[PDB]
Design a protein around this ligand. Structure first.
Ligand SMILES: [Mg+2]
Length: 161
């Protein structure tokens, strides 16, 4: 089935809907959720992207989450992503506002969430190839390995937590 995605203007108003392929082909501005999954003891669940991913294959994500699909509300979208990527469901999510990120390959209004989970996790190997618990110190010591958008989300979380 084709994945359909909300396309937004500069003001984060939905003005278009595109296939996932069109979104990536034209670098269209879209929404995504970013969820800091932390263990409540100082560590962040970090996820290595498979090497088949369109956006930044093989890099580390400091957050779970993904593109918000057509007509999805932000929290249900975050919950769907966490369920699909990590096999978690019914865990409390805290909301931490929004941020905008763009580089040469994407334009995104991000919605930031966090949750505390110790697992267990059920992962998708076609998307994530590895997970581990890292402290924020450990992450910044390796920050060249991380997607800049997930790093931005984490940094924003770290300044609130
Ligand atoms: Mg997705």
């Amino acid at each position: 089935s084709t994945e359909w995605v909300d396309i937004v203007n500069e003001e984060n108003e939905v003005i278009a809907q595109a296939s996932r392929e069109q979104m990536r082909a034209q670098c269209l501005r879209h929404r995504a959720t970013y969820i800091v999954v932390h263990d409540g003891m100082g560590k962040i669940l970090v996820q290595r992207r498979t090497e088949t991913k369109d956006f930044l294959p093989g890099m580390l994500d400091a957050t779970a989450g993904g593109v918000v699909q057509a007509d999805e509300q932000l929290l249900e979208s975050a919950r769907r992503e966490a369920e699909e990527e990590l096999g978690i469901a019914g865990v409390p999510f805290a909301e931490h506002g929004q941020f905008y990120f763009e580089d040469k390959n994407c334009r995104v209004w991000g919605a930031l969430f966090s949750c505390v989970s110790h697992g267990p996790f059920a992962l998708q190997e076609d998307e994530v190839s590895e997970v581990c618990w890292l402290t924020p110190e450990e992450i910044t010591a390796r920050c060249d390995e991380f997607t800049p958008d997930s790093l931005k989300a984490l940094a924003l979380w770290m300044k609130r937590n």
